[PDB]
Structure formats: structure tokens, C-alpha cells
Design a protein around this ligand. Structure first.
Ligand SMILES: *Cc1c(COP(=O)(O)O)cnc(C)c1O
Ligand SMILES: *Cc1c(COP(=O)(O)O)cnc(C)c1O
Ligand SMILES: *Cc1c(COP(=O)(O)O)cnc(C)c1O
Ligand SMILES: *Cc1c(COP(=O)(O)O)cnc(C)c1O
Lengths: 515, 510, 61, 61, 60, 521
């Protein structure tokens, strides 16, 4: 509720994004894979222009010809060696042809025809080579070191935002989730993911799997164990988490692996892993229980591409969603036979991830559904950018940047809180007791806590810096605390938040020092 | 049989979705996009404060943007795209009178795709630009630009998908309801409404071939039935490919203003610009019409997935909304509770957006900012081409293609002011009549069959035409698109069709 | 002038020079052309008018 | 400095640089020389001074 | 190749009546400007000659 | 069969690289150092201009004279200034400074050797190795062998055409100088590739090989007991490839110190002949040449590390004071007189002719010694590869290559339980794919053991050669009883490694399937 008055004191689209959707829009962006996208376009347009047969000054192209594409492409690569984006395009060619072993002419054609976006995505679910390019990036950054590439299929959608909207709808229409079914949600999570299941169109009952502060926001075993209840149809999780911003740990990952393995082989897991790369040796639920999990991976935060709206829905070639589909009643299966009659002859063989594509645009419009070709191409380039960066220079650069900002934030707050291996810190929690105790001791700590309120703290900082933090969610109001993103502000702004919260601390301390 | 005889991507798009994919595309606004981006990138690289070789950037600053943008333009006068961007700044700053720095930062930030679209229905300066183009091309020459709002979506495909779902959701279309579809129309549109998701009853408004595929008054009049809650139209039409004439437009404006002021119109005018002096049902009855305009066919931008849902500030979808039972009002109030305090004030165009992403994610919904920027730029291109040079170039390409197509079939059918002809109807009777007489005309039709013809043509050239539909199968006929093949391909289609005609005439002769 | 023409044409039509940002553009022009005596003169006269006469440079330009 | 000298001399004399329009002229200089190391450095230092330290960009330049 | 070999003038014209692709390119132009929108491009054969002057000489 | 499976294997899969692995037991790198090569070609252009500067008549023909050393630094620096924007050129310029400022050598002299050298217009002088290239290449060598205690003036090199020509040269030389005679006992670190096994066992030499078998359960390190087998005075020469091929590991500190005592307190007359081509691929390599500089003849190749197999660049290193010369000091007057008449045309006190210089003389039938040595352009390309590794202080090139190898290792073991645990003595230019270890990782030790009996190296390599086109090196070295194959992580691309892995996982799921059926019975 303090949210309404916070926005008033401080107004900026960013601050709103944080309070309305609960995300920090990044102030950083992968430039190289973008420059290449643009250079690939200039070359693409030339390829277009080569095919227009008439004399006009108006500016019309024909479709790029696949014949002799390598030769022209290479000629392009050579004449522009001093342009950042062209060198990348070139290496990228090598990687796809040489390391992945796909057809180079076909790769070039998919990329050129794609960024011209003069053709409907085909197949609808995701372009042929891009899927294979993007899936190798996914597996890797998800920690799926054992899953064979061919066993993983992707559906390219418009951000993780379109993902959740498409999944929940498909789960309802396909009777894999009905009103009354219990949904286990790893909490805390941001509001949008609490609201969706509660909507009247879904009417699902949620079961909190609560993260524990004492465990650095890991889900204790007793908590995970709740999934044993066979009534829980699915486990909705955001990992690494937002707001806590920590990745689930080993214990937690085996815990679930076992529950699924020995008690709930039928359970559906739905995990959102956008912050994965910001973690250290991330391993996704998808990697631990691939056959039971639907992955939603967005390129949004890692590449500073929120505006691009790029994400994928990944599913194992063999999974429980299709299983649950066969376990449906003849009567339900007969009605779905009508629903997808047009997609193909044997609807009982239509895999769930293909139903996601069909359902996203009413089905009758399948052949023209799918994420835009130019969008997919930019996705394919982000993927390549990561894969070819063997030393992880880009990843390290961002992680040291989050750290520099953290260093600046707590400079006057008693340095950052101790960081362990499960830490991500895309959002960092500024707790008043912990800051005061690190500055003036645990006595003053317990007394300062009682003297203020989250709103108090937030309002004051919002008033002295214009920056509005996110109230501390996760451990019973007992604790004054806010959350900041270490990805959306610049250093002097993190200096100001911390300078302000010191002054408040020096004041809280002056009071305590005179009785 | 004839199902694989011909296999390809174009052949499948036509057979599987009644669409001809254009083999032309507007390149200046595209070259401008990529050029815009290069510049955008430099802007990003200016805000990165650390020594690196990794390839990182911050966000472009708006402060000093025009100045730096002018240097970029001055520096590259010699690149087609740069010239256009520069001209487009003047059009926006000078003719639309918008803020120049704001326009530029929206475009730079917009194409770097580094922020969520805000607002979600459509970036601000882009909507004012695109609606300016919409109004012009839809011939809505009397509507005040400000009464028109657009929702930026992923082609006509997301729109139809969005609208129907939002109409069910808000009870503006309930089961048992009647939907007047303008026929013939391609398959996907007969399907959506017959999906059990909605369960409505279709009411065909049949175009008349004797009328040159125009909707006869008796048929338009069917619309008077108050059981018809919505008129579903693709205009210009597909497969007929003609534009409703004035008599028609007018006939309907009437049925609305004098019998059905409650009627809902859903019109898809993606082919508008290929018609001669197009006027859309949204221009005739702005308060009763949801327009759906796709950029796909005209700029040859199918892969880009760019379109808009336009709605008049004051319209019947919102009026209808204020007429539901409190029962339904209270349930909607709960649905969109997270969106705003007074849910009863939420305009229907805005519910589309929210319903497009399960409501709870409305804050992050909307079309990608890079797409929207490409859209603004396609719009700017048309808008700045006062002489319609582009339009003419395409219109003559279509005709050129038609001439080559019919060279050996009696020459293309008589043109009409309502002809668009993005799809052309190759009728067997009319072609043998022009070639050998009314007498052979009649014998030949009875002699052959639509499947038979499509085969001879397919088996011989590999292209498979759409079966001529819309007038009692007694007429063997097929439709080809004059937009997706090069001349020698149409030459082959006709060569094979005349080969057939000859053999049937050899017979008659005997 | 051509900077203010808003339409697409090959005929050769310009619009009215805008004062806004004129210094920056003129200054860019002077730099890009330091080897043409005419430009070396335009730049110094901008200094005279603004620096010695105390007048307004954007107006002068 | 040369932009601040008002008279025609061939002796090489300049005047005090002006703080007006300075970010813009500096930005043309940078873009105009991205291939000269020291220069890319200068560009980034402005961002560092303007973006991370939050100090006045034109006063800095 | 027909145009590169041809502008070099290094081979005798083959076939003698007229080069292959030029004949096809030229007849397309001849049917357009002579207004023969009913005649199929492949029903027309051309004999490349040195101006109308050469044309009449040969024909008579 | 070992010598029969090889021939049939060569059939199922033909590819130049596959044959190389089978016919030479070598893995030809698909990576190569470009900066030193561009540096080279561009020095070539500078040098051609330096040559044209000296031709005195008019022509269009394209003739040039010898390059003049006078004023060469000025011109070189002009050339360099005028080309800062080309990669190799930047490189060239710094190397001049490395040679000048860090090695303290004469710059005009350095440049002239490089210019004159790459033009190949003079006979190598001295034949053994060009003066400055020798002092450069040895700095590289000393560093990369971990010979961190051996003053440089003490090491000499003989530029030869790869470690392939170094061996042919060294065995014949040992023979002709009587340091190695028929039936002499030559000890060989094992396992080792077939070539180094056939040579000493040739009728020309007829020596007796004494296996110094490596121990699988020891990660292929040689156990004290096997090493100690060198105290036998009947053993005249310890022949060894380190880091090993195919075990692909470097002898640890223990094994190195072992041999150290064996030479100080028991065998000071022992002759060590070590091939250390894969040294740079190991973590902190130290060569036996580092450990016993005067008992060793180091044969170092530039092929694998720089991706120069086709350049054929190699050096033979020997300490000034070494046991090959002592041994020639100890020959009977009788034999020394026979030598005096072989190397007479070379020098007056043929008894002073050092062994390493006999290496040169011998290679070209003595009479031709003044026109012997590696080609000047090759020695120059050799000096440029050396400068390159020496100037790269952070070892980026080396890290890049190690990381490439590890990447290929991960792609390969992806469906096999991950690569086996690495050591500190691990090089892995070649990696061992052991069916017992894989099956054990995937399905446990119980299965592991049943598998090893159910299969064969023959079985394994054929499934893989069939399914992927890749033919592996039969796993050699243990109580055979272990189906296993070797691959090089240096001669294929990722998707091929994945192909190999995929094939093997299939094979183990298949065995496990049979094993599962049987157990549940
Ligand atoms: C920021 C964020 C995303 C991004 O979603 P996109 O719609 O792909 O931009 C997804 N989930 C969570 C938990 C986030 O914090
Ligand atoms: C070609 C076409 C469109 C465009 O489809 P998008 O989803 O916008 O690509 C729309 N409607 C009809 C009737 C068409 O034939
Ligand atoms: C000018 C003219 C020509 C041209 O003759 P060429 O021989 O082809 O130059 C032909 N016919 C007529 C009647 C003319 O007036
Ligand atoms: C590859 C290899 C060589 C290199 O031989 P060169 O003739 O120098 O190319 C030498 N020894 C072994 C152990 C090898 O594996």
C-alpha cells in the first residue's frame, strides 16, 4: 500500500517498473551482438537490392538469393574488417559451420532473410538453425551438462512475459490444470506471478513454498517437502529468485530431484531462470529434472534487452506434460481432437510445446504464429555472443560491475553483507538492523529497528535521493528493510542512497547515545 | 495427391493460410532502421564509463541528442538510409509539430531495445505517427487524428487472436451469438469463430460475382437482423481482392445509423493501399469499428509481425461495455483490479493490451520497441512520399505481372475502380471464351474440373493455385497471387493453361 | 534549408533554416572545413561578432 | 582557443575557450576520432565523470 | 558470360541468327513495344541484323 | 590385433588426419598462431623492398640485390611507422625491442639476420643455427622447459627440420661416433608411439629396448621401480617422450628427482634423449633437460604448439659440457683416429669437434657441412614463433589453447559422466577414453567390471569409426584387459567430439541394457 505514496515522492519510469512490475531495468547492454545485427542488416538489404529487377528510384527490394551467399557474405566480411559488428558476424559464421556443424549457406540465408523479415516464421515454433543455435546457449547457461542437445526443443516467444501468459492458457485449455488444483509457488516472488494463478479464468489455489532468511533465502527441506502432497499439480519457481536474488542450492536441487524421483514423478515444474547467468555455477531445475520441467528463459536482463522482448520456452523431448496429456480422459482427448484437427492427422501425437505455439494465436492462425524473424535473429546473435566468449569476459564484466555498485552502496554502511556461492545480488537487500549492527553493534541494532518502519526508511531515502526502494518482503514485518537493484542505477546514485542511510544511522545513534 | 506434387514455402503459405507472401519489400525505411541503429549504438557506447574490450554500453542520453544526430546525418549524406532519417526528423518536428529531441530519444532508445515498452499500448510519438498514416490510407479524411488510438501488436495475427479473446472475456460476445462474416474469405477466419472457445453462429454475407464480387444490398441488409452482434470483414477482400464500393460502404453506414447503432464491425484492411481510392469501414462508421491494419503486405514485412488495432476514443465496444449486467461488471472489476481503481473506466482498447498477457503482466506487455520503431519508419516513408511513388511502383508491378499472366489467355480481365487484384481469379470458362468463343466456353467448363486444372498447372510448373471459391463449383477455377512470383513464373502458369485449353479445343474442333 | 524540407523529392526544395542548434551545426561546419579560406573567415567573424561586439551569436548566425 | 580569436593574424594567437556548446563540440571531436586511442579514453572519462560521479559535464570539459 | 564473351568480340556469333539470351531479351522488348500482348514470347524468333537498312536488303 | 587392427582401421575411415593418427600416432592441430605468421609475411614485403634497393640496372623483370645492413634500423622503423595499422607489423616492431632491450643484442644485426634470412639468398651461417635466432630460440626453450637454472650461454641449439629430422640425425650420429653400438641397451619410457619403437630396433642400429612401463593406476607416471631399472650400466640411453604420447602427461617432480639421483649417485654416464614437444601444453613443465642438462639431448618441436606441423621447425639442444662429448673423449685411440679421418675436412683438432656440431656435419655427409642447417626463412619463422611466446607475458595464447582443449574435452564427455578428474601432471593433448571408467561413471562399478569383459578395444573403436567416421588410437599400456581408445583434443571440432561421445553413450546404454537384463534374472 505504501507503493501508491512512494511513486508520488519519486517519479521515473524506472522507479515505476520496480514498483509496478518488480524488476530492475538494466543500464547496461551487449553492444557487439547489436552492432552485428545492424551490420547484418546493411548486408541483407544489399542482398535484397540485388534481386529487384526494375528501374526505380523509390527503394524496393526483392528477396535475397541463397545462391552464392557465402561468397558475397565473405566479400562483405573482408571489405569491412574494421567494423566491430562485421568481425563478429564472421566468427559467428565459423562457429555455426565449424563448431556446431550446420550448413553455412542455410545459416546465412536464415539470418539474412530473417532480419529482412520479408517472410513468415517457419516453422512457427522457431526458425530451424536459430533453435539449434539458441538451445546450445541455453543448455550451457542452465547447467544441463548432460542433456543431449537434440532432446531439447524451444518455442521462441516475446519475452518471458509472453511465456507465462501462453503457458497458463495452454495448461487450462488442455486440462492439465483445472480450477481448484493446487499450485506451489516458491516465495517470495514478485506480484505478477502471484496474481496470475488467482485470476478467475484459472482459479488455482496456491501453496507457499517459503524461502528462509536464516538460510540466505534458501528453501528449507521441510518447505520443499510440501511438494510431496500429491494434490500439488505444479511447482512454480523463479530461480534465481526475484526479490531474494539467490540461486537454489545443491541440497535444494537434490531435494526436489528426489521428491520427483521417489514420490512425485507426475509433478509439473515451471521455472523462470532469467537471472541464471548472473549466478556463479548456475544449475537449473530444468537440468536436474528435465523430463518434468518447462523452462522459461528470457534474454532480457543479461543482454540489456528488455525492449527486444526475447525469450524461449524450453521442454525436453520426453516429458510429463505430454504424459499428463495421455492420462487425460477419452472424453477430453476427443474434444482436443477437434481443437487441433487442422494442425495434423493424429492429434494424440501433437506434443505440448507445439500446442503452446498453436494456442498463442487461436490455432486457426498457427501457420502465421511465432516470434518475428528479425527478433529471432537478434536472439541467435546474443546466443552466439555468449557461446563464442569462451573466457566469459562479458559475464565477468557484468558481475564485477554489480559488485562495484554494491561496494559503493555499502561503502558507508559497513561494507556489503558476506557473500556466499549461491549469491546473485541483482537486487540487494538493505536491512536496517544489519547495517546498524555492523556500524554500531547489536545493542544499537535491536533498538534502532523498533524506532523505524520500512516505510519510514523508504520514504526518507526516496526524499533525499529521489530513489524509491522495494519494501522488504520475506520475513514478517518485524524488519525495516528495502531492496534495490544493482543493475539500474549508476554509482553516484548508489552513493547517495548509502550516504542518506548513514546520516539516518548517525541520527538514530545520536539519540541512543544520550538515552 | 496433388497435395505434395508441389512443395515449397510459398506454395504452403497459400494452401495452408490463404496468404500470398510478397516478393518485394520497402528497403529505404529498412536501410534507415539499420542505419538508425548504428547511430543508436554509438549513443549507447557514450554512456559506458569503464575501460573494456568486452562490448558494453549504457543508455543513450536525451540531452544533446539532436545536435549529435545532426552530426551523424551531415557525416553520412551518401547513405540512402541516413538521408531518410534526416528527412523523417523534419517531417515529425515540422509537419506533425512534435518534440524533436523526444522523437529522437524514442527512436534511439526504442531501437536499442533496452527498456520495456512504455506505455504498453504503444510508444507515444510512434502512435501519433502511425495513426497519422492509418488515417490517411484508410481514407478516414474527416476523423480528427486525436480521436484515434492504436494498440501495437504482432501482425494481424496477434490482433484477431487478441480481439476475439477479449470480446469473449468481457461478455461482448456470448455463446449462441450470431457473427456476420463477409464471404468468401480465407479459411482462418471461418475457423476462429467456430472454435468452441467462442461458439458463435456464422452468417454469411455473400459477395456477388455478377457484381464483380461486391456485396449486393439484399446481402448487406442481412445485417439488420439484431441477432447479428458483429460484422466480420476483410476489406479489400481475400480471395476476391476487390474493395467495397461506395454504394456498399454507404449501404452499411445506413444500416448502422438507422437500424443497428449497436452493431460491431471488425474489419481487416491490410490490402487497403493496393486499392485505388480506398475508404475503410472504419472511416465510414468510426464509432462502431475495430480496425485491424497489418503492415505485412504493403512494405513486404511479413516476418517483422507488425500491425495495429485502431479504435475511436468513443465507440460501441465501450458503450456495449457500459451495458452489461452488474453481475458481469463486478466480475470484470475483479479481473482488472490490479490495473486501476475504477475498472468501469477502462477503455476496451486498453483491455485488449491487458488481456494479451493475463492482466497481471500488463506492465510488461506490448510489441517490441524495435518493431514499433520499424513500424514508425514504414509509416513515415509512406507519409513522406507525397506523390505515392511507392504505391504506384507496386500497383504497376501487379499489373505487369497480370499482363504476363494472361498474355496467352485473352489478356487480363477488364479492370474496375474497385480492383486491387493482389489475388487474381483464373476462371476456365472466361479464358476459353476469350480464346475460342462462348460456344466452346460452355462445352469446356462441363468437360473439365477445378482439381483437373490446378493439377495440369501444378504438375507442369510446380506452383499450386488456390481453388476458385465463391460461386457454386460449376465453375472450374483457380486463384493465383500477383504478388509472390516473378514474371517468368506467371508466364509458365498461362503457357500451361493455354496448353490445356488447346487440347480441349482440339477436341471440340473434332 | 534542406534540413527543414519534410517530404521525399528529387526536385530540389528546401524549407526555412531553424535557429535552434545553429551554433553547433555551424561550428561543425567550420571544423570540417578548416582548409577552405572562406570557412576560416566565417569562423573568425563569428568570434568578432560574439566576442568583440558583445552581440548574440545564434542570432548573428 | 582558436575559435575564440577574433582578428585576422597569421601569427598563431588564440583566445579563451568558451564553456558554451562545449559538450557538443567535444562529442564531434570524439566521434570524429574513434580510431585514435587517447580519444576513446577521453570519451569514456567524460561518461565516467558525468555518469558515475554525477558531476557537471560541461564544467568538467 | 554471353555478355562478357560478346562485348569482347572474341568468338564468332553462335548461333548465327542471334545469340541465345539476347534473342530472348530482345523479343521480350519487341512484343512489348509492338503491342503484341497476346503473342507468347516463345513463338517469336528474331534475326539480329545491321539496322533496318540491312533488314530490307536481305528480305527482298 | 595391434599390428593388424591398425591396417583394417585405416580402411573403415579415410581422412588425412585419421591416417596421421594411425600412421604416425600424431594429432595434427586444427589451430595455428597467426600473429607470428602475418609478422613473417610482412617482414617479407619489407625485405623484398630492401632487396630492390640494391639492384643497379633498369628492368621490369623483377630482380633484386642483397639487402644492406647499413641504415637498416631507420628504414625498418619507417616501414613500421607506415604500417602500424596492420597486425603482424605491430608485432614485428616490438620484437625488435624485445631483442634490443630485453636480450641486449645488436639491433642492426638482429634486423639484418631477419631480413637477409627471410629472403633466403645466403647459405645458413653458421650451419648449426643463425647466431641471433639461436640466442632467441634458446631463451624460449629454456623458459618453456623450465630450465630456470641453466645459464643461457651454456645451451646450444641445432636448427633442424622438426623432431622428425632431429631423431633420424641423432641416431645415425650416435652410431657413426660409436656412442651407441649394436645390441646396446636403450631404455624407453612406455607406452610411446610406434615410430620411436621401430627406429632403435632397426637393422642399422639393432639395439635392445628395455621397457620402462608407465603405470595406469598411477595416472601413467613411472613408478620408482620402473625408473630404477636404469641403474643397470648395460643401459646406455634413456629415450623418452615427455609429456608423453599417447599417455599425454608430464613426469612429476618425484619421477624427475628419481632420475636425478640415478644419474648422480649411480649413472653419471647415462645418456638421456628427450622429446618435449608437448611441454607448453602441460601446466608447469620441467624437462629432464632441465633436471640433467649435461646428460641430455632435448629434441624440441614447434609443430603442435604453434600449429606448424607443415613448417618443420625444430631444435636439438645440448649443454656445452655434456656426456656425449665425454663419451667421445673416452673412446679408444683406435676409434678416435677413425673419426679424425671422417671429420678431417672440417677441422684441424677433430678431437675438439663437439658432438652437436658432428650432428650438423653428419646430417649432410660431412663434405657438405658448409651448406647445411635449416633454411634461413624457416629459422626466421622459428625466431618469430619464439619471440611471440616470449613477448606474451600473460601467456594469453597458451591460455587460449589450453581452454580450447578443455572445451573439446567437455563436449566429448558430455554424455559420458564428464571428463575424468584432471591432475597437475595432465596435458591431455590426447585423451584416453576408457570403457571401464566411463561405464563406471554412468552406471557404477558393478556394471563397470562386467562391461570390461563384454567388450573389446576392437569393439569400441569400430562402433565409433562406423557411427562417426572417426577412427581412434587403440588404448595401449595396461594389462590389456581394458577396452579403450585415444583421441586428440587437437584435431577435431566440437560437433565431432559430441558425435564420438554420443556413439559411446549408446554403446554403454546398450551394454547396461544387457547387464540389467541378466542381473534381474
Ligand atoms: C525482469 C524479469 C523477467 C523478464 O521478462 P521478459 O518479459 O522476458 O522481459 C522475467 N521474470 C522475472 C522474475 C524478472 O525479474
Ligand atoms: C496477408 C494478410 C494479413 C497479414 O497477416 P499478419 O499477421 O499481419 O502477417 C492479414 N489479413 C489477411 C486477410 C491477409 O491475407
Ligand atoms: C530512320 C529509319 C530507319 C532506321 O534504319 P536503320 O537502318 O536501322 O538505321 C528505318 N526505317 C525508317 C522508315 C526510318 O525512317
Ligand atoms: C607431433 C609430434 C612431433 C612433432 O614432430 P615434428 O617433426 O617436429 O613435426 C614430435 N614428437 C612427437 C611425440 C609428436 O607427437
Amino acid at each position: 500500500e505504501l507503493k501508491d505514496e512512494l511513486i508520488k515522492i519519486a517519479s521515473s519510469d524506472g522507479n515505476r517498473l520496480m514498483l509496478n512490475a518488480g524488476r530492475g531495468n538494466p543500464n547496461f547492454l551487449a553492444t557487439t551482438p547489436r552492432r552485428a545485427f545492424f551490420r547484418l542488416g546493411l548486408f541483407a538489404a544489399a542482398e535484397s537490392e540485388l534481386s529487384y529487377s526494375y528501374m526505380t528510384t523509390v527503394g524496393v527490394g526483392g528477396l535475397a538469393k541463397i545462391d552464392g551467399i557465402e561468397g558475397r557474405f565473405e566479400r562483405y566480411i573482408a571489405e569491412n574488417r574494421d567494423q566491430e559488428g562485421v568481425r563478429f558476424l564472421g566468427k559467428s559464421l565459423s562457429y555455426v559451420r565449424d563448431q556446431l556443424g550446420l550448413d553455412p549457406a542455410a545459416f546465412l540465408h536464415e539470418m539474412v532473410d530473417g532480419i529482412l523479415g520479408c517472410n513468415y516464421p517457419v516453422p512457427p515454433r522457431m526458425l530451424n538453425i536459430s533453435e539449434k543455435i539458441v538451445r546450445q546457449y541455453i543448455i550451457r547457461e542452465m547447467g544441463a551438462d548432460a542433456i543431449p542437445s537434440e532432446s531439447v526443443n524451444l518455442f521462441a516467444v516475446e519475452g518471458g512475459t509472453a511465456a507465462m501468459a501462453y503457458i497458463f492458457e495452454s495448461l487450462k485449455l488442455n486440462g492439465l490444470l483445472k480450477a481448484g488444483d493446487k499450485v506451489a509457488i516458491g516465495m517470495p516472488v514478485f506480484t505478477p506471478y502471484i496474481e496470475i494463478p488467482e485470476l478467475a479464468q484459472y482459479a488455482l489455489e496456491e501453496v507457499a513454498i517459503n524461502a528462509d532468511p536464516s538460510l540466505n533465502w534458501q528453501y528449507p527441506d521441510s518447505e520443499l517437502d510440501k511438494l510431496k502432497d500429491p494434490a500439488i499439480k505444479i511447482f512454480f519457481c523463479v530461480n534465481p529468485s526475484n526479490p531474494p536474488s539467490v540461486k537454489m542450492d545443491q541440497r535444494s536441487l537434490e531435494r526436489v530431484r528426489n521428491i520427483v524421483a521417489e514420490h512425485r514423478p507426475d509433478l509439473m515444474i515451471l521455472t523462470d531462470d532469467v537471472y541464471g547467468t548472473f549466478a556463479d555455477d548456475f544449475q537449473s531445475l530444468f537440468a536436474i529434472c528435465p523430463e518434468n520441467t518447462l523452462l522459461v528463459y528470457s534474454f532480457s536482463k543479461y543482454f540489456g534487452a528488455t525492449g527486444w522482448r526475447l525469450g524461449v520456452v524450453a521442454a525436453h523431448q520426453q516429458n510429463v506434460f505430454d504424459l499428463a496429456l495421455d492420462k487425460l480422459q477419452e472424453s477430453e482427448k476427443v474434444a482436443l481432437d477437434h481443437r487441433y484437427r487442422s494442425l495434423l492427422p493424429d492429434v494424440r501425437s501433437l506434443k505440448f510445446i507445439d500446442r503452446l505455439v498453436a494456442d498463442s494465436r487461436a490455432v486457426a492462425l498457427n501457420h502465421t504464429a511465432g516470434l518475428s524473424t528479425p527478433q529471432q535473429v537478434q536472439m541467435a546473435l546474443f546466443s552466439l555472443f555468449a557461446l563464442m566468449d569462451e573466457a566469459d569476459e562479458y559475464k565477468h564484466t557484468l558481475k564485477q560491475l554489480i559488485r562495484r555498485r554494491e561496494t559503493t552502496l555499502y561503502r558507508e554502511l559497513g561494507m556489503p553483507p558476506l557473500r556466499d556461492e549461491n549469491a546473485v545480488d541483482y537486487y540487494t537487500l538493505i536491512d536496517l538492523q544489519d547495517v546498524t549492527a555492523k556500524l554500531y553493534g547489536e545493542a544499537f541494532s535491536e533498538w534502532a529497528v523498533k524506532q523505524s518502519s520500512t516505510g519510514d526508511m523508504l520514504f526518507r531515502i526516496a526524499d533525499e535521493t529521489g530513489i524509491v526502494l522495494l519494501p522488504g518482503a520475506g520475513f514478517g514485518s518485524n524488519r525495516p528493510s528495502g531492496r534495490a537493484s544493482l543493475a539500474n542505477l549508476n554509482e553516484y546514485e548508489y552513493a547517495a542512497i548509502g550516504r542518506a542511510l548513514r546520516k539516518m544511522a548517525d541520527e538514530l545513534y545520536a539519540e541512543y547515545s544520550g538515552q
